[PDB]
Amino acid sequence: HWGYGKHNGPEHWHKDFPIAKGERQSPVDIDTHTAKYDPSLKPLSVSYDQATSLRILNNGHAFNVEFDDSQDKAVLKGGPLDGTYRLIQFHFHWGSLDGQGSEHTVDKKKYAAELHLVHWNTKYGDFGKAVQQPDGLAVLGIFLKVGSAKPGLQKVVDVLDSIKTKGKSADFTNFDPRGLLPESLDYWTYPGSLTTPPLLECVTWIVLKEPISVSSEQVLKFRKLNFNGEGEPEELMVDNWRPAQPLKNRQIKASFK
C-alpha cells in the first residue's frame, strides 16, 4: 500500500488515487510576494479551551492525537470559513534532517516539520459525510523550526516510545492543543486537499505564518518512530511529507497586510 518509500511514495499515489493529479491538490509552495491581502477575511477564531483529547495512535504514516468530537468543544471559525469546524485530530509531517520535513513551503523554504490540526464542518453531521463535500474540512497548518524547545509538545514527545510501531495506541487524555500555537494568527489561505491518500479535495487550508520552535531533542524523538509494525524490520518514520503540488487555478490569500 501507499507510503513514503521509493516504490510506494508520492510519485506512485496517482495510480490508486487519480485525484493526486487533480485541480486543487496540496501542499503547495506559498509565494509570499504573489499572495494577496484579503480584507474580506473575518478575524480567525481558534477556541481550544474545551478540547478533549482521547488517545494517540501510530497509523504507519504518522501519529494522530485524536479528540472527542461528539460535542461542540474545540472549534475553528472565522477567517475564510463559513460556519463552525470541529477539531477531530492533529498530527505532524517531519523529515530525516532539520532542513526538510514540511509539506507546504514558504518561498520554496522547507521547515523541519509541519503540524496539521484537522477540523470538520459541523453542517455535515460527521467527518465521513464532510469528506464528500468541497468545504467539508479545515486544516490549520503550523510550521516547526528547530531552536528552543516547545514546552507544550513535550507530553507528546514523551508518549511516543509507547506507540513506536504501526497499530499501537495509548491513552492520551487532557492534552491541551493551545500549547502548540504560535503567538500570531496571521495566515495564508487557499482551497486544497488532504496531503495523504485518499487525497480528497475537501480542505480549506489555513497556514500560519509564524512557526513554532521545537528543540533538536524533540524532533529527534519523532524520528525514532517506526513505519513498520511490531516484529517487522525497522524502517524509521521520517520524511513522511508530500512535496509541493501545482497551484493551478488558485490564489493564496493573506490575512495580513
Distance in angstroms (rounded) separating the CA atoms of residues 239 and 100: 8
Surface-to-core class of residue 249, CB atoms within 10 Å of its CB (0-12 exposed, 13-18 middle, 19+ buried) = exposed
Any contact of residue 116 with Zn ion (CB under 5 A)?
yes
Binding site for ligand BHO (CB under 6 A): 116, 118, 137, 139, 194-196
Look up residue 236 and give its DSSP letter.
B
Stretch that binds Zn ion, among 14-22, 32-40, 116-124, 234-242 (CB under 5 A): 116-124
Neighbours of 107 (CB within 10 A): 10
Q: Judged by CB under 5 A, does residue 104 bind Zn ion? A: no
Annotated catalytic residue within 1, 61, 104, 119: 61
Q: Which is nearer to ligand BHO, 147 or 250 (CB)?
A: 250
195 is in an annotated binding site: yes
Nearer to Zn ion, 86 or 116 (CB): 116
What residue 139 binds from Zn ion, ligand BHO, none (CB within 5 to 8 A, per partner kind)? ligand BHO
118 binds, among Zn ion, ligand BHO, none (CB under 5 to 8 A by kind): ligand BHO
Smaller CB distance to Zn ion: residue 116 or 168? 116
Sites for Zn ion among residues 60-79 (CB under 5 A): none
Amino acid 219 reads V
Shortest gap between Cβ of 93 and Zn ion (angstroms)? Answer: 6
Q: Is 61 a catalytic residue?
A: yes
Annotation-wise, does 204 bind a ligand?
no
Please tell me whether 12 is known to bind a ligand.
Answer: no
Task: Specify whether the CB–CB gap between 10 and 103 falls below 8 A.
Answer: no
Q: Is 104 annotated as a binding residue?
A: no
In this structure, which amino acid lies at residue 68?
D
CB under 5 A: which stretch of 47-55, 113-121, 142-150, 231-239 binds Zn ion? Answer: 113-121
Instruction: Please check whether residue 205 is in contact with residue 247, taking contact to mean a CB–CB distance below 8 angstroms.
Output: no
Closest by CA position to 224, among listed 215, 208, 237? 237
Task: Give exposure, 143-181, as e/b (b: 16+ Cβ within 10 Å).
Answer: bbbbeeebebbbbbbebbeebbbbebbeebeebebeebb
Cell numbers found for residue 169: 495506541
- Annotated active-site positions, please? 61
Q: Which residues are annotated as a binding site?
A: 91, 93, 116, 195-196
Query: Would you tell me which residues interact with Zn ion (CB under 5 A)?
Result: 116
